Amino acid sequence: LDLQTTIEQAWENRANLSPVDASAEVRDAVEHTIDGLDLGRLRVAEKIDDQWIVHQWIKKAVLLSFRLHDNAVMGQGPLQFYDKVPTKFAGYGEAAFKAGGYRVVPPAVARRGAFIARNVVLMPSYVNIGAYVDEGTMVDTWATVGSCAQIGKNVHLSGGVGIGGVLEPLQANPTIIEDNCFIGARSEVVEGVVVEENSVLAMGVFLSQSTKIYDRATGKVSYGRVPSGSVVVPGSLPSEDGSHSLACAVIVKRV
Template identity: 35%
Template sequence: MSLETEIADLWNRYQNGLTAADAGTSELETLDAFLAALEAGEYRAAEKVGPADWEAVEWVKQGVLLNFGLRETEPRSYGGVDYYDVLPLRETDDLADRGARNTPDGTVLRPGSYLGEDVIMMSPSFVNIGAYVDDAALVDSNDVVGSCAQIGADVKLGANTLIGGVLEPVEDAPVVVEDGVSLGAGCRVTSGFVVGENSVVGENTLLTPRIPVYDLVEETVHYGRLPPERRAFQRYVESSVSDEELIPGKAYKPAVVATSLEQETLEATQREGALRE
């Protein structure tokens, strides 16, 4: 029986009333094997199915959810701090073999998260269960990579950036930041938004499906994605609530403007090579 089949069977039993109190050694061994496979990069919570489309791998997200539904909360300790959770923190022995590194004093990885070759995690930062961080990505200080988020190769997450997690429903694709993207400090990417490859996003930009992306290259408006090879930044446009009598003057709502990505802009965002020497 494959791991996918075992998780599917366990999910069916969970949907039909299986609880953490009922879960025995066999069930927990299946969940442990699942987390180990995610940490080895054997499976991912989403896959690309077209030039601009990603789909959730539902059985993987089911496996993540089962780790919360079928494990008991227990007292634990990390760095002298007591806490309560269903899982301990992720072991990091495998990172050295891939040349990845997490700096001390505050880098936290939960089980089931994957870090590729030459990944750098600066302190403090957090990578949640089911997240996939591909080769040569940089997770800077005060960054959060949410549950099942997909971070591509050569991505730079600026300091204080939030990549939201998407666990439920299982058919919803998580946040995706494709290869070569640079997110400026303070960016927020949520609710399954897809940032197209090699794009450069300005500081403090909010990318979410509820905010329109005005693409000046294609002269169209996108929701839920930023096309590849764009330079994007936050702006505010007039809102329809300006007509409300209770609001004096104009009212504005957030929007994202996307322009072409010039070569010199791309070169200006490249990281110092000394970081990886």
Template identity: 35%
Template sequence: MSPLESAIEELWDRREEGLTTSDTTHEDLATLDAFLDALEAGEVRAAENSGDEWTANAWVKRGILLNFALRRSRRRSYGGVGYNDVLPLRDTADLARRGTRNTPDGTAIRRGAYLGEDAIVMSPSFVNVGAHVGDRTLVDSCDTVGSCAQVGDDVKLGANTLIGGVLEPVESAPVVIEDDVSLGAGCRVTSGFVVGESSVVGENTLLTPRIPVYDLVEEAVVYGHLPPERRAFTRYVESSVADHDLFGDGGAYKPAVVATHVEDETLEATQREGALRE
């Protein structure tokens, strides 16, 4: 256990015993600041891949929760607009050294978010505390990357895409987008869903553990993850409530995701995207 992890666990125990913002010391706040610095530097992450499975680092998620529980909300300003929050936006001075760009007029990166080298964050977009955005990844306009979400290297998040985050319970892994994934405009990934590496997801696709993925490659129905190297898109399948008298002869359908092999022309389109970014 690292000194930082030990300090966070100690603070968590004290919080469980009744520690409040009124009792928080300068030393406690210094620990919370050091924790956020470690998140921004990529030294700690809310989840990690151990073998074939993503697991949550519970102590990291506790550290994020402590930053909400033990800080007072303050009046702040962003782009000339006042707001109230316990955390400020992230200092972006280090991004230039990494070759990372964040465009003005609406790009909000919260304290405790990590952005990798040569990443691009377009405005308006929002990257929340605990999120990890990998090298050369594009966060396009109107995107949201939720708290603790793990987004890999060389990922393209299409415009108006929502990457949800899972902060509680602390044992649950957050949403994960693995390396070399391309998500079309308007996609939503929620509730700890994992998108496998080198996959291409069609626009306006909803990926959540409650919606089945019909994997035509392995001829299996899976939940909670999209296997690697898949092309996925939304279709509708007949629902079990279709026999209800209320529907008459019209039937009833529910959303599903169909996954096939990534097509050669899709790979070529992704490569063209990479060439444009270079």
């Protein structure tokens, strides 16, 4: 399709693109892709045939949007900033917010190019570009939804929860929290880990691709994915000689 081809050609030529040197065609393809992300009409990853697939060209558009803009002053006084990515809600009035159907509790901020669905509550928190936050999700205080992350419907991201961004590598799927999950306070899920639907993480669960996930029912370690309905708590596995343990995640039940 139109946008994708233009973005892919611009990507190959990115060494020659700058905020002062970019064609109308390139600028417009990037802007239209960011617009589509901001409205949820495009998404960095989606679930097709029961498998999450990533659209690398959309990540390329996001990265180009950084290359095509200089930093600019934003704000005033004790809240003065300098960045090249617009915030999502600058210039919104009552009509735009009423239309979006979500709440933005001060001092929450999202970047333009993140999609926030109806009935979401953003307590003070941060939602980065490319993220998709689906209907009914609660993002609690000092939580973070990182770049490109896909948050399902009726998810609860508790206080201080971090969902790690994945813009580069281009080939890598983003971090995914599927529908109805509860992610307990202080937990972190990063690096493209997939938490499948209906799962529960206790407080303080830290998952990357390298984290051992010990399944108490089977005695086996796995990585990168929490099966649907799993209850995951922090634990540890002992060394062979008994001198120490290393922390891991433990699946204690599956519902």
